[PDB]
Design an enzyme around this catalytic site. Structure first.
Site, PDB file in Angstrom:
ATOM      1  N   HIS A  68      77.627 106.859  77.599  1.00  0.00           N
ATOM      2  CA  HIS A  68      78.299 107.853  78.474  1.00  0.00           C
ATOM      3  C   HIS A  68      79.204 107.141  79.472  1.00  0.00           C
ATOM      4  O   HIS A  68      78.993 107.281  80.679  1.00  0.00           O
ATOM      5  CB  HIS A  68      77.305 108.739  79.181  1.00  0.00           C
ATOM      6  N   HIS A  72      83.765 106.666  75.885  1.00  0.00           N
ATOM      7  CA  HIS A  72      83.301 108.018  75.458  1.00  0.00           C
ATOM      8  C   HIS A  72      84.335 109.052  75.921  1.00  0.00           C
ATOM      9  O   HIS A  72      84.808 109.799  75.092  1.00  0.00           O
ATOM     10  CB  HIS A  72      81.890 108.340  75.962  1.00  0.00           C
ATOM     11  N   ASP A 107      82.100 113.635  81.754  1.00  0.00           N
ATOM     12  CA  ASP A 107      80.830 112.888  81.964  1.00  0.00           C
ATOM     13  C   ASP A 107      80.959 111.963  83.177  1.00  0.00           C
ATOM     14  O   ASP A 107      80.127 111.045  83.301  1.00  0.00           O
ATOM     15  CB  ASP A 107      80.420 112.077  80.739  1.00  0.00           C
ATOM     16  N   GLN A 269      68.657 111.512  62.654  1.00  0.00           N
ATOM     17  CA  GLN A 269      70.086 111.882  62.497  1.00  0.00           C
ATOM     18  C   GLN A 269      70.179 113.095  61.577  1.00  0.00           C
ATOM     19  O   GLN A 269      70.979 114.007  61.882  1.00  0.00           O
ATOM     20  CB  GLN A 269      70.921 110.694  62.032  1.00  0.00           C
TER      21      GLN A 269
HETATM   22  C1  LIG Z   1      73.744 114.131  71.824  1.00  0.00           C
HETATM   23  C2  LIG Z   1      74.096 113.362  70.597  1.00  0.00           C
HETATM   24  N1  LIG Z   1      75.349 113.171  70.145  1.00  0.00           N
HETATM   25  C3  LIG Z   1      75.646 112.459  69.000  1.00  0.00           C
HETATM   26  C4  LIG Z   1      74.655 111.966  68.174  1.00  0.00           C
HETATM   27  C5  LIG Z   1      74.919 111.200  66.917  1.00  0.00           C
HETATM   28  N2  LIG Z   1      73.295 112.140  68.581  1.00  0.00           N
HETATM   29  N3  LIG Z   1      72.148 111.661  67.976  1.00  0.00           N
HETATM   30  C6  LIG Z   1      71.173 112.131  68.841  1.00  0.00           C
HETATM   31  C7  LIG Z   1      69.708 111.858  68.651  1.00  0.00           C
HETATM   32  C8  LIG Z   1      69.276 112.615  67.366  1.00  0.00           C
HETATM   33  C9  LIG Z   1      67.782 112.449  67.155  1.00  0.00           C
HETATM   34  N4  LIG Z   1      67.096 111.294  66.906  1.00  0.00           N
HETATM   35  C10 LIG Z   1      65.719 111.647  66.839  1.00  0.00           C
HETATM   36  C11 LIG Z   1      64.678 110.665  66.655  1.00  0.00           C
HETATM   37  C12 LIG Z   1      64.970 109.313  66.579  1.00  0.00           C
HETATM   38  C13 LIG Z   1      63.942 108.383  66.337  1.00  0.00           C
HETATM   39  C14 LIG Z   1      62.615 108.792  66.153  1.00  0.00           C
HETATM   40  C15 LIG Z   1      62.326 110.152  66.193  1.00  0.00           C
HETATM   41  C16 LIG Z   1      63.365 111.083  66.436  1.00  0.00           C
HETATM   42  C17 LIG Z   1      65.566 113.045  66.997  1.00  0.00           C
HETATM   43  N5  LIG Z   1      66.885 113.545  67.205  1.00  0.00           N
HETATM   44  C18 LIG Z   1      67.371 114.871  67.497  1.00  0.00           C
HETATM   45  N6  LIG Z   1      71.692 112.910  69.917  1.00  0.00           N
HETATM   46  C19 LIG Z   1      73.011 112.855  69.801  1.00  0.00           C
HETATM   47 MG   LIG Z   2      77.443 114.958  79.351  1.00  0.00          MG
HETATM   48 ZN   LIG Z   3      79.980 113.607  76.719  1.00  0.00          ZN
END
Ligand SMILES: Cc1ncc(C)n2nc(CCc3nc(-c4ccccc4)cn3C)nc12
Ligand SMILES: [Mg+2]
Ligand SMILES: [Zn+2]
Length: 313
Positions: A68, A72, A107, A269
């Site tokens: 952030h 970004h 941000d 992902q």
């Molecule tokens: C806000 C945002 N913008 C862009 C992207 C690409 N991302 N990628 C995530 C995390 C996704 C994510 N990783 C996990 C997880 C990871 C390891 C172990 C267990 C769970 C769950 N979730 C939802 N957030 C964002």
């Molecule tokens: Mg934000």
């Molecule tokens: Zn942002």
């Protein structure tokens, strides 16, 4: 005024595409941004002396965090620039002005922590703003910089266009609270499928601009695979520092923030692409047909994450 900006040939061509990467040379990000305002809005929109000082005060108030950060901001502004140049006539003179600014500012002063962490830590910003904590903070910092001497880039707007443009930027910045996205898309989905969606309804525009903002803010998922993969490292580096802090407060963080559970990233992902990105860019393309490239690119990257699991990379 007769002072244009031009980029090298490869950038001049590549910048018009949705999957453009702004590169690793910081010192060119500001000119990229200006080049985008000049072609998006006109050479007459902003006084160059003021815009440049505003850009540099914005950069100053972004912090050195893995994700952030200043890079970004310019990425998310460039994605909005793509959406505005492929939907030339659907948007007012003011909307173009404020949306590029909203994206650059979206941000401002992020510390690399979720709204949740600010409330569980009991941060002062949680005391002052109970919902969309950071996003209300971000807008507030934008107004601060807009009131520094020599920084009012909107000086030549009427009293009423100035309030119209500061309102476009406030809703636009609030909309990047991903917690708000889920309802906003559900409503847009039902409004398009029932045929009620109407772009002269100001509250409908607001939702539509809301969805573009989630689209632009998520645009790492719409890039070429090696950019997507390398950005995700930065995204997890913040989340895991936050999990580290959560553990310090005596709270098991969610697995997303637990660096012990990196192994599950590919599967995370997947969830995210299915629950968030694909819906985001599906609904966005229905409303705005020329943004299809964002969806196609997002779908390719879903497919590349499926590959990572199948141990094919
Ligand atoms: C806000 C945002 N913008 C862009 C992207 C690409 N991302 N990628 C995530 C995390 C996704 C994510 N990783 C996990 C997880 C990871 C390891 C172990 C267990 C769970 C769950 N979730 C939802 N957030 C964002
Ligand atoms: Mg934000
Ligand atoms: Zn942002």
């Amino acid at each position: 005024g007769l002072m244009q900006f031009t980029l090298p040939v490869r950038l001049c061509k590549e910048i018009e595409l949705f999957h453009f990467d702004i590169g690793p040379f910081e010192n060119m990000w500001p000119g990229i941004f200006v080049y985008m305002v000049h072609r998006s809005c006109g050479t007459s929109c902003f006084e160059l002396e003021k815009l440049c000082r505003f850009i540099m005060s914005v950069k100053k108030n972004y912090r050195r965090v893995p994700y952030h950060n200043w890079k970004h901001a310019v990425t998310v502004a460039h994605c909005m620039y793509a959406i505005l140049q492929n939907n030339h006539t659907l948007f007012t003179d003011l909307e173009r002005k404020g949306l590029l600014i909203a994206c650059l500012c979206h941000d401002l002063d992020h510390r690399g922590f979720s709204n949740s962490y600010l409330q569980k830590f009991d941060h002062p910003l949680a005391a002052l703003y109970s919902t969309s904590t950071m996003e209300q903070h971000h807008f507030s910092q934008t107004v601060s910089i807009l009131q520094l001497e020599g920084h009012n880039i909107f000086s030549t707007l009427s009293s009423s266009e100035y309030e119209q443009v500061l309102e476009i930027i406030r809703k636009a910045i609030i909309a990047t609270d991903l917690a708000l996205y889920f309802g906003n898309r559900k409503q847009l989905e039902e409004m398009y499928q029932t045929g009620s969606l109407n772009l002269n309804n100001q509250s409908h525009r607001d939702r539509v601009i809301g969805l573009m903002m989630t689209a632009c803010d998520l645009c790492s998922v719409t890039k070429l695979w090696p950019v997507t993969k390398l950005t995700a490292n930065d995204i997890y580096a913040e989340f895991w520092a936050e999990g580290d802090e959560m553990k310090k407060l005596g709270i098991q963080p969610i697995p997303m923030m637990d660096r012990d559970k990196k192994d599950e990233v590919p599967q995370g992902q997947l969830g995210f692409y299915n629950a968030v990105a694909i819906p985001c860019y599906t609904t966005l393309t229905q409303i705005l047909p020329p943004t299809e490239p964002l969806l196609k690119a997002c779908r390719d990257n879903l497919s590349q994450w499926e590959k990572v699991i199948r141990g094919e990379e």
